[PDB]
Amino acid sequence: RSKERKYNESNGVQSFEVGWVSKASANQRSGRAGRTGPGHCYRLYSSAVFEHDFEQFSKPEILRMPVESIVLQMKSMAIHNIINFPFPTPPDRVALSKAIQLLQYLGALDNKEMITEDGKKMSLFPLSPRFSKMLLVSDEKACLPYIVAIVSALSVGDPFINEFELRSKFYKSRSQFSKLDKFSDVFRLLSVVSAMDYVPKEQKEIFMKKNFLRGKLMEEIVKLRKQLMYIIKSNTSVVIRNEDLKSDIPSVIQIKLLKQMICAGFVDHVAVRADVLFPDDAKITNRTSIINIPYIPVLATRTPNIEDCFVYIHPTSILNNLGEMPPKYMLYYSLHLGGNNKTRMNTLCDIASTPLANIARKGLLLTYSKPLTGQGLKTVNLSPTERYCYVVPRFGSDLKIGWDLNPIAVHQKKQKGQWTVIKFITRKGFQTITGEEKE
Amino acid sequence: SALFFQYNQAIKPPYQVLIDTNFINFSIQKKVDIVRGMMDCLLAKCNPLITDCVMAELEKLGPKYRIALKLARDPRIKRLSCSHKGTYADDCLVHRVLQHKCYIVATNDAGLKQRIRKIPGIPLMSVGGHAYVIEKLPDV
Amino acid sequence: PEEMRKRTTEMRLMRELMFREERKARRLKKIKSKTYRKIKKKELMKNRELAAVSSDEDNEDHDIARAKERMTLKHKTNSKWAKDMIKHGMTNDAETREEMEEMLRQGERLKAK
RNA sequence: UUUUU
RNA sequence: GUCGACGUACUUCAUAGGAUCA
Ligand SMILES: [Zn+2]
Numbered sequence: 001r002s003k004e005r006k007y008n009e010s011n012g013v014q015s016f017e018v019g020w021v022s023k024a025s026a027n028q029r030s031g032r033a034g035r036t037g038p039g040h041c042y043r044l045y046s047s048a049v050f051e052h053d054f055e056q057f058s059k060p061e062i063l064r065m066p067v068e069s070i071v072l073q074m075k076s077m078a079i080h081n082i083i084n085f086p087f088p089t090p091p092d093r094v095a096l097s098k099a100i101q102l103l104q105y106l107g108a109l110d111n112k113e114m115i116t117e118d119g120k121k122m123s124l125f126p127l128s129p130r131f132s133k134m135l136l137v138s139d140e141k142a143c144l145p146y147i148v149a150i151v152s153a154l155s156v157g158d159p160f161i162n163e164f165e166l167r168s169k170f171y172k173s174r175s176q177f178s179k180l181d182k183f184s185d186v187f188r189l190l191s192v193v194s195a196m197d198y199v200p201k202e203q204k205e206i207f208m209k210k211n212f213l214r215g216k217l218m219e220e221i222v223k224l225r226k227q228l229m230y231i232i233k234s235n236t237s238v239v240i241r242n243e244d245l246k247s248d249i250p251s252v253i254q255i256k257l258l259k260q261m262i263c264a265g266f267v268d269h270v271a272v273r274a275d276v277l278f279p280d281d282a283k284i285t286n287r288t289s290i291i292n293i294p295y296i297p298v299l300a301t302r303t304p305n306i307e308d309c310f311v312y313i314h315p316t317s318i319l320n321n322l323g324e325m326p327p328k329y330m331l332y333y334s335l336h337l338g339g340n341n342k343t344r345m346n347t348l349c350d351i352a353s354t355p356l357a358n359i360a361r362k363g364l365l366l367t368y369s370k371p372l373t374g375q376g377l378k379t380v381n382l383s384p385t386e387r388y389c390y391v392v393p394r395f396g397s398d399l400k401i402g403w404d405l406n407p408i409a410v411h412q413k414k415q416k417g418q419w420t421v422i423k424f425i426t427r428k429g430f431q432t433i434t435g436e437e438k439e
Numbered sequence: 440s441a442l443f444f445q446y447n448q449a450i451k452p453p454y455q456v457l458i459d460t461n462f463i464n465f466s467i468q469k470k471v472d473i474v475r476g477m478m479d480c481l482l483a484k485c486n487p488l489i490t491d492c493v494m495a496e497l498e499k500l501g502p503k504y505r506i507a508l509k510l511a512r513d514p515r516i517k518r519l520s521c522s523h524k525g526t527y528a529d530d531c532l533v534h535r536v537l538q539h540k541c542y543i544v545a546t547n548d549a550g551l552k553q554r555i556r557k558i559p560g561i562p563l564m565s566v567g568g569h570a571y572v573i574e575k576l577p578d579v
Numbered sequence: 580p581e582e583m584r585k586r587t588t589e590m591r592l593m594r595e596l597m598f599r600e601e602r603k604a605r606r607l608k609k610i611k612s613k614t615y616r617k618i619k620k621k622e623l624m625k626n627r628e629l630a631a632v633s634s635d636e637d638n639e640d641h642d643i644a645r646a647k648e649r650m651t652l653k654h655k656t657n658s659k660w661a662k663d664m665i666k667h668g669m670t671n672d673a674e675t676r677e678e679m680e681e682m683l684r685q686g687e688r689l690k691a692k
Numbered sequence: 693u694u695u696u697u
Numbered sequence: 698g699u700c701g702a703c704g705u706a707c708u709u710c711a712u713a714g715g716a717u718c719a
Contacts, residue, residue: 061694376632383589384592384596390626390630408630460650464650464651500647529649683714
């Protein structure tokens with residue numbers, strides 16, 4: 001028996017299943033004996049089961065896990081036609097298609113599947129295309145140290161030990177690292193990694209044990225932080241000391257920005273509370289546990305029964321202890337099939353509507369309605385070709401689940417007969433504009 | 440000590456009556472004088488009293504209610520000081536009656552009337568129809 | 580110069596534009612059905628709410644609004660319309676009862692502290 | 693379960 | 698004639714709304 005990770009491409013749900021190993025795998029286990037002397041292999045299954053139920057060889061690695069990183073690398077080779085690449089066993093077309101789509105949403109590839117300048121720029125890093133994009137946008141307001149730490153933490157895996165794997169001490173350590181934000185798993189990761197920087201080398205082991213932190217992973221996170229800061233400094237202009245990783249607390253302005261950079265790499269993994277879209281089907285009460293509040297991921301394939309698309313908060317997230325209603329929209333890293341046949345989502349951080357439209361504006365995930373009309377909302381016309389108006393941005397791609405965001409004031413210009421949104425406008429900016437034409 | 444079951448044996452003429460903010464509106468609307476209307480209703484000398492909360496409440500009203508503000512500042516209407524931060528007049532009026540049982544409350548808000556009604560021995564005056572009416576005052 | 584021609588065209592587009600809003604505004608003006616106007620009003624309140632076009636009311640603003648409501652008592656069933664519907668059994672119907680309750684809840688909002 | 697520049 | 702119209706006198710049906718709690 002072996003516990004394999006099965007990835008359901010259709011819904012993006014990750015499952016761990018205990019199934020029969022392949023015959024070659026069993027043969028390899030039997031080979032462990034006989035290296036130092038004649039040995040015995042006692043198999044706990046009958047030969048009848050072995051000959052019939054055991055697969056000859058386990059499925060190749062390529063056919064089981066995502067290929068977005070590989071497509072980007074090959075596209076950086078100018079291997080435009082990946083389909084005609086002489087693979088040992090070619091990857092499935094569906095997996096390739098989603099890889100291209102995910103890269104396009106990130107801006108790595110254009111609509112014709114050529115590598116963009118950003119696509120080339122991400123391929124220089126040792127990270128997945130998602131995490132690169134986080135590092136790409138980090139240049140603003142000295143947020144780069146925080147994004148590097150967050151990126152390294154997610155790239156290496158969670159250094160946190162879960163409750164199931166293990167009480168007051170556990171929550172006490174959790175309380176310390178959630179202080180930056182009450183709605184972000186990502187900032188919990190950043191809290192630990194940057195907190196370690198002020199731990200002197202001698203006490204580092206005591207810190208990791210005291211906080212239920214996996215010792216090995218954080219050390220690699222430290223190592224991988226240096227390599228990232230090295231590549232950026234070397235290629236932007238290089239010796240990096242442990243002093244370089246020491247960073248102070250983010251400002252409130254920065255924290256909002258980090259949410260935006262994080263959302264940049266996970267623009268395709270935004271989930272909205274179901275009661276917002278379908279209040280009839282998702283009736284939330286004040287008694288309802290936060291862990292049981294349904295959410296709906298963007299671009300989810302519509303089923304006849306909408307409940308099939310519901311996604312719930314993972315037990316491990318800090319939100320389960322939040323004490324108030326969860327945010328309207330949520331970012332999630334991956335989806336796991338819980339024991340109750342309920343999909344669970346690993347939250348990243350909350351995002352507001354207006355920032356979400358701003359980031360998706362540069363992606364293919366935002367469309368604009370017709371101008372709104374009424375008191376307050378009036379299409380101010382500067383000229384026959386340019387105007388100021390309110391529009392309702394629609395988020396998400398009519399076979400999927402897209403939803404409309406809050407209206408946002410925009411500047412539109414008529415280009416080749418079509419109205420194109422140039423820039424967003426604050427409420428004050430639009431009101432002053434409405435006054436200006438009146439005077 | 441001033442209350443005999445539900446009968447207040449302390450309130451005696453001349454009466455001291457607290458003027459609520461809305462009382463002045465309907466006094467003006469019905470063309471009823473404050474000083475004489477109370478005299479007719481009770482057949483006694485009445486000492487109208489305006490507190491700081493109602494007085495501040497009136498000033499916030501705006502230019503439209505200038506007449507009410509002028510009547511509120513008539514020299515015959517004595518002023519009552521307040522030693523509390525809150526400016527809500529209804530809460531102030533409920534407070535004073537609880538402390539000392541000698542005041543008539545002149546008001547027309549349904550909500551404030553109910554709260555005063557629960558307090559025993561508080562005569563509650565209102566303006567309705569063509570003149571003032573007093574509810575819980577046996578000497579009438 | 581030929582720039583003058585450019586000026587006339589820009590005016591011509593602006594004139595053609597103003598007519599279009601006039602025609603649309605004229606037509607929407609004639610439709611005065613309750614259901615139609617009710618749907619438009621509901622959608623407008625969502626957009627203004629969602630976009631937060633309306634500024635938050637300061638505590639002083641709320642106090643002034645509450646003061647006028649107490650001064651007048653304009654949102655109780657003693658008004659001419661409310662008294663007319665109540666006393667003549669027209670509020671037993673669902674629709675006119677909703678308007679009465681809509682009026683009463685709005686009055687209660689201004690009474691909140 | 694594994695595991696990677 | 699269990700007749701039509703009108704006049705008169707009655708009967709009846711359409712009342713719940715918001716907030717909190719379980
Ligand atoms: Zn007072």
